[PDB]
Design a protein around this ligand. Structure first.
Ligand SMILES: NC(=O)c1ccc[n+]([C@@H]2O[C@H](COP(=O)([O-])OP(=O)(O)OC[C@H]3O[C@@H](n4cnc5c(N)ncnc54)[C@H](O)[C@@H]3O)[C@@H](O)[C@H]2O)c1
Ligand SMILES: NC(=O)c1ccc[n+]([C@@H]2O[C@H](COP(=O)([O-])OP(=O)(O)OC[C@H]3O[C@@H](n4cnc5c(N)ncnc54)[C@H](O)[C@@H]3O)[C@@H](O)[C@H]2O)c1
Ligand SMILES: NC(=O)c1ccc[n+]([C@@H]2O[C@H](COP(=O)([O-])OP(=O)(O)OC[C@H]3O[C@@H](n4cnc5c(N)ncnc54)[C@H](O)[C@@H]3O)[C@@H](O)[C@H]2O)c1
Ligand SMILES: NC(=O)c1ccc[n+]([C@@H]2O[C@H](COP(=O)([O-])OP(=O)(O)OC[C@H]3O[C@@H](n4cnc5c(N)ncnc54)[C@H](O)[C@@H]3O)[C@@H](O)[C@H]2O)c1
Lengths: 384, 385, 390, 378
């Protein structure tokens, strides 16, 4: 929304990212197919309002402090280990990544794994390669644990394969297609011919699939954990495979070493069709942060976003010290200006707040100046 | 989550709602299979903190103002015309409906409508019934979806199953389902589509968004579908495009009664029988979360607020929208010596609602609560946890 | 696949048809965007071995007999009202149409009908256009398919994708696709179905198979769809069932036959059904061009509309074909001919009709003997035409 | 109906259901396989025998039979049956050709999904301790060669996964869904990200996928052969794998054992039961030998009238004799379908006549030299 806002994109992010940026009115783009050298990065990033990078660019504390106009960082990938998160945060610079771009990919893999495991293909294949010398998926029940981005897309594909889909989730969800939410996990485990996990990594899920749960699964069933974490007690999984209670499994990958001996287990390890989704996803985050201040899904920043309801919108980033918010609201109160919406979120170190006001530019601009002055302020900006 | 919080459910909402309420720790439930007479409703709702009803129960201003403990209203259906929204709002009472349980039926409806419209069936059928004597496959056709949310995504899935190519336009990037493709400019989506279906909310950004200009950008001989909305399409313009034959047909909802190639579906806000379970789950969920964390997401007569749960203490304040409320709040926490961890204030009409998370002990939180209730213009405030 | 084989195509058949012919080695093609006048037609179809036409071409006996090289006619459409079937048959000229090109289109139509009928849209729509003022999801419902053939099968696939449970009744055992289930007894399929769709041909076994008794057997509040045909459903019984509300609605392909239904707002009457646009045109083009190619190369008359149907698998050797009047002695004459040449018949397929017979014969012999047999076969009394396919 | 049905190795209850459905009662069932002594005893008066992969139906056992009309192999196909001995006796052997269609289509989907992602190789390495392809299926093109039972069901599943389906066949096929026929094999091969073969085993398919065909395939593509034949030239495929021209493959079972990016593979008994039992019944009723594995295939449309069938040694003069019989009797032949195999000849003849005229032609047909058997079907 201004050709003065410079976007520096390196390591060759997908073209759709550029298409998205231009459609939103941001055409001041410096593009690079490969990584920049230290000296090249420093001079290109110096006046960049935004930088988009992948895995090879190292955004160290020094490079960041060197950038004098940096507003936000877009990690066009899932990982952000190449970016110094804390350094960016201290300067009020959010880092966005692409957390859901691999959704479809994981769903397809699960389908491929269950189809072959159900037929005992992995074991037959390993023996064939050594010189040594089974059911249809349709009509079978798939039990999905975690019915979110991946869980829902998987259920859709499973139904297309003629499977009956059931899911367990700690939250009530709207079923897509003929899927059925099962309230008790043990009930899901009992019915399921195939069980697939798609939950996040947290105390709630730590070893949720232990000896007991695996014991609850149907005799001859399959356990899939296509996306890597710590949700499955590997030793317990190994015992159930050795005992043959489970006819096979697929686990994302030592730690899985106990499974290496099993021919009926599939062990599987940002360079494919993911680039388009990533380009669209991350450019979108940069665009929205620029236009409306949304930090939803930022990885090193308090998360906030507010619907577009007209009026003027300002944003304030500050060290989380008592008195800042009081100073902020005072600016509008002592002036009789009304606040239509306000959303503040904090961390131990920082506080981020977006405010919608009913006023004209003059007042808005004036308010912005006062805001920047408030002690503890890191950055302040008038969004519209 | 207390067992003293009374839930009054009338007109026989699905048993799943009760199970859900019980699972959330709410067991103080009065349940009736049907509607009650004016006398019974008044007696039953007098001490009800929450009421769940359907289309028959008339929750009028009188009834509302008489219910002295009412905290929230849940319409276990889509419509809320039987509920006096403004009356409830004035009392700081949000009204929740079931905005998503009927997602699937709207998607199925659009598929049925486009399939027949494409073949010219509505027109051929109307003439056939009048005695007057008298097409395209959907397969390989492009479906343009405006608003890729709950309905758009499900519609896209069904359309791809019919062999159609799905493209969509939205005001933000959306993760696509199947082979659906996002299109950055609305004009481009309109240009390429053989069928355009609208699935967006009602609000200044969508009022008449499909006007004479947008409709003329649609492909010649295309179809426009507005399955369940309100004021998104400029009717005069649509009639004009139909008369000129720019569009081969449409489905909506008049000046359109003259067109045999237009399907008119008088009121669709009706929830299906198969959806009663989902509705019970959906609306009970809304009441529960409002009661527990103050979320007013999806409320139909209230500013929408929702703050992630990060422990600590949480307070909520409903008031007359005006400058100085927030400042009045800051001073109270300052005097009380507490820092605000998170805050979310939204306004709608002449009303303001704000949820505040603070780190403080029970006593301090209560003292803050009493002060907050004394702020002039305050409608009500409570300590959620 | 020689070059002396001419293809006359009028009324602009789809390019796919030509691509198909060429790929098959038939390049001698005379294309025309539209129909030709009586003078031009006779002039063009003069030395044409094959002709492909549509609806705007009248192939009369005069035109046909005028043609001295015509071996087969391609009607790139469903109907063949425009061609003199008997005249072609008398000349030993088979007529091929596009029997299954509209399969997908009908299956799509059924889905659209049941979706709207299930929600009561036809009725609400009719009332709305009149000023008068004013429902179940398809997902989870059971679809009962009577006749699991071309359409039945594609319909079932679309229904399952819509989340419906598919069951079908057919007089012959079928390999179900997806989760489809074959039901042995009609009464059973009829009792369990929320929607029943008919996709059977018009023969004695189907004549009014859906009578008052069958309809009464249907689940109360169900839908009946017959999106093609005309003799499988008893309209009077249907109207009664709709009047009593035993059925919630219906879709019937339409007319004195459907008049009893005109008063029902919850019934969809749909005329034109057979020949969409470029899309249906592409299927048709590929289908009929294929028929012509197969007839030319191996003598197959499967699906011909005015000819005995014969089709013999390709097993090498020499292939001859003989078209004749159904008079006695022809079959005997054929044998005698091969005995004298001391040739063995590997396979023979003869089929007949009114007063005409068609036989394809596979023999073991050198071209030399083949051609000698061909000439002999042509001299058989009652012979209309004979050819050496390969 | 003195039509005894001997069933061994325990065929699914459905076969029994089916036979009964057609009145055909009299069923000697044996959950297990009988032996030489008992087998000859039970098969002695057996009209139809149903067996699996273990029964050894030798020339002796068959010769032992005296009323055997057909043999139903309720399995992947013929097994320990002396097909040749069976044919000599004018006895067709029916198997279950399309019963596991769905199963093969599902297998191909599973294989291409993993191969596209390089999982086979990654998995092989992971099981050897080593650590370290990869693409989604949606948006990719699947090239099917042989658009028949399996090909069509495969296309349906492929499209549901978001793939674009193209197929090549030797005749025009009605496409299901968005499947598109491609006229030239070379075009199909080059455009495909995945090629799967579903063609019959015969001369026109033997090694049809050679060095030339494989070189025409897109670089980094996958070749899948679930067929039960030798359609692919392994030596050529191996070369294409070593050179990385192909990113992987899946084949039924070696030179490919060295390739980690190659998949090597080996209750539905209900289908088999209903399919095979269905062949046995149709043959008894209308004489159809469609799909028989050791018999000329003949199938004639039921158009009323009388239907006579004749099985004979392929001696010249049989057809001459047959047609002379009807000629002399002044009986018109409505339809006639004769097909032959290396040793046998089978013809079905439809005529317009009453019982009298029929049985008259039947006795004369039985008297022809080379006759193995002849029956009045109806
Ligand atoms: N989607 C992607 O692109 C991607 C990429 C890499 C890794 N992952 C990983 O895959 C997993 C799932 O990802 P997603 O995108 O579908 O996540 P998601 O957030 O959309 O859904 C996770 C689901 O799990 C449910 N859940 C949480 N705790 C649960 C519990 N204890 N029991 C049952 N259900 C519970 C949640 O309510 C939610 O519906 C996560 O571990 C994620 O980190 C996803
Ligand atoms: N889901 C149901 O059961 C149901 C029942 C009756 C009526 N409706 C109506 O259908 C509409 C959409 O419902 P939904 O469930 O899909 O809602 P939703 O919130 O899930 O999705 C609406 C989508 O519209 C997009 N959008 C918003 N403003 C837009 C604009 N100006 N231009 C383009 N896209 C825009 C949003 O980003 C979002 O993705 C609403 O008007 C709703 O009242 C829904
Ligand atoms: N497929 C098309 O393109 C097309 C175009 C125009 C009209 N039609 C009409 O649609 C109908 C069906 O067409 P189709 O292409 O699927 O035909 P089809 O021949 O493929 O299948 C008809 C099915 O009906 C079954 N059947 C026959 N008699 C039966 C009986 N008495 N009871 C139960 N099942 C019986 C048959 O076994 C077969 O499976 C026919 O009336 C046909 O004329 C089809
Ligand atoms: N369907 C099953 O259950 C099953 C089980 C085991 C093995 N098989 C094997 O799979 C293969 C195909 O099985 P199906 O059931 O789909 O057979 P099918 O007969 O239904 O289809 C084979 C298809 O191949 C086409 N074709 C023939 N020769 C061709 C050629 N040279 N090039 C291209 N296409 C050609 C045919 O026209 C036909 O459409 C066969 O080898 C069969 O023995 C099938």
């Amino acid at each position: 929304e201004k050709d003065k806002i410079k976007f520096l994109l390196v390591e060759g992010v997908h073209q759709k990212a550029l298409e998205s940026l231009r459609a939103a009115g941001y055409t001041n783009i410096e593009f690079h197919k490969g990584a920049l050298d230290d000296e090249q990065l420093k001079e290109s990033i110096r006046d960049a309002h935004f930088i988009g990078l992948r895995s090879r660019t190292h955004l160290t504390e020094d490079v960041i402090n060197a950038a004098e106009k940096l507003v936000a960082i877009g990690a066009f990938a899932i990982g952000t280990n190449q970016v110094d998160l804390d350094a960016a945060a201290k300067r009020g610079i959010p880092v966005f990544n692409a957390p859901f771009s691999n959704t479809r990919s994981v769903a397809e893999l699960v389908i491929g794994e269950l189809l072959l495991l159900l037929r005992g293909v992995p074991e037959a294949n390993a023996k064939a390669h050594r010189g040594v010398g089974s059911f249809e998926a349709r009509g079978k029940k798939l039990g999905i644990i975690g019915y979110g981005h991946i869980g829902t897309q998987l259920g859709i594909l499973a139904e297309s394969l003629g499977m009956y889909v059931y899911f367990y989730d700690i939250e009530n969800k709207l079923p897509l297609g003929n899927a059925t939410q099962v309230q008790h996990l043990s009930d899901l485990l009992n019915m399921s011919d195939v069980v697939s996990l798609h939950v996040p990594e947290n105390p709630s899920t730590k070893n949720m699939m232990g000896a007991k749960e695996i014991s609850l699964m149907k005799p001859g069933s399959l356990l899939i954990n296509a996306s890597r974490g710590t949700v499955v007690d590997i030793p317990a999984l190994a015992d159930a495979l050795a005992s043959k209670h489970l006819a096979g499994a697929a686990i994302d990958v030592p730690f899985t070493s106990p499974l290496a001996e099993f021919d009926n287990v599939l062990l599987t390890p940002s360079t494919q069709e993911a680039q388009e989704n990533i380009g669209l996803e991350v450019a979108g985050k940069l665009i929205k942060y620029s236009d409306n201040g949304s930090t939803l899904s930022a990885v090193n920043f308090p998360e906030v976003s507010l619907p577009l309801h007209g009026g003027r919108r300002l944003m304030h980033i500050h060290e989380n010290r008592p008195g800042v918010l009081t100073a902020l609201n005072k600016i509008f109160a002592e002036q009789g200006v009304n606040i239509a919406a306000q959303y503040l979120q904090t961390s131990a170190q920082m506080g981020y707040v977006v405010i919608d006001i009913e006023a004209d530019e003059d007042v808005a601009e004036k308010a912005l100046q006062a805001m920047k002055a408030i002690p503890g302020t890191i950055r302040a900006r008038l969004l519209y």
